[PDB]
């Protein structure tokens, strides 16, 4: 009756150090709707993230998209601290520039 | 190809804290065109597409009235269903809904559907012929009997056919530069080193619309490979990648095939320096 | 344009 989310962290455009960009965290396939997502920078929470609206797939499993604005640099590390009812402990997905 | 106009509804029953949430978004193809939310103080049917804002206030008033009627019926559905399963009055339960209609290449009706769920389990739905239901369990077995006497299927079918094809044709006519567009993905391929004697090729396809696309890996003729859900880019386009673990040395024996509407011919990708 | 017909409540 309950499923676990599938988390992907990526950037809208191919990231380049110095050009404005966006960071997305697309969690899909979970149930129920009540989820907590946060976009982290250097382990700290980013204050200006905003999300799309609650849709669901053909098998009645939701999905969302949290995005914000950022500029890449070699000394900064980003992540996405997702937490759901089924997740006993939070899942901290990092952002690697090759996925 | 074809075109779609689907609606999604949700009602999460928050107990003790007040009234259930309600989000009612509407889709044309893969593009959101209208919005709703029971938490924001606007309490209107806000737009989300820069080709529907140009309509008058009677349209918005009608949409708001109908959406609030949908919310009022969802609340009663949640209450009765929670009461009917002999559950307690402290958990949170979800009710969902979906209906739409598809027009063919001639912009004439092809197929319409209308489903209904509860806690992620199918509850009731119209069949493909739009004449009978598909009740799955006992509660659905009673809902079917209740709705086969009021002729709900007939009203749903008349609405779907007439009004849905009319509205979708109007929306397609207005959104000529946005709804009737197709984008060709930009494709490139990468390389990794999983171990000291292997590799991991990865086929990328970015910024395509509509959402559907097929990526297949073929070892010089025969297909096998891990895929990912197609993911939005945040501005109307999509992204996708597919990868497979390959033994080292045999890097020229693998091909990636791309099939999209905006691509007249299939794309083959092979590794190069 | 959302469904503008009459509304019915799920029973049991």
Numbering used by the authors:
A (entry chain B): 1 to 99
B (entry chain A): 1 to 224, 228 to 276
C (entry chain C): 1 to 12
What is the paper's account of this structure, in its own sentences?
The recognition of antigenic peptide-MHC (pMHC) molecules by T-cell receptors (TCR) initiates the T-cell mediated immune response. Here, we report cryoEM structures of two distinct full-length α/β TCR-CD3 complexes bound to their pMHC ligand, the cancer-testis antigen HLA-A2/MAGEA4 (230–239). We also determined cryoEM structures of pMHCs containing MAGEA4 (230–239) peptide and the closely related MAGEA8 (232–241) peptide in the absence of TCR, which provided a structural explanation for the MAGEA4 preference displayed by the TCRs.
To further investigate the structural differences between these two peptide epitopes, we conducted cryoEM analysis of MAGEA4 and MAGEA8 pMHCs in the absence of TCR. 3.4 and 3.1 Å resolution reconstructions were obtained for MAGEA4 and MAGEA8 pMHCs, respectively. The maps were sufficiently resolved to define the conformations of HLA-embedded peptides. The side chain of the central R6 residue was not well-resolved, consistent with its flexibility in the absence of TCR. As expected from their conserved sequences, the structures of MAGEA4 and MAGEA8 peptides were highly similar. The most notable difference occurs at peptide residue D4. The D4 side chain projects down toward the HLA α2 helix in the MAGEA4 peptide, while it protrudes up, away from HLA groove in the MAGEA8 peptide, appearing to form a salt-bridge interaction with the R65 side chain at HLA-α1.
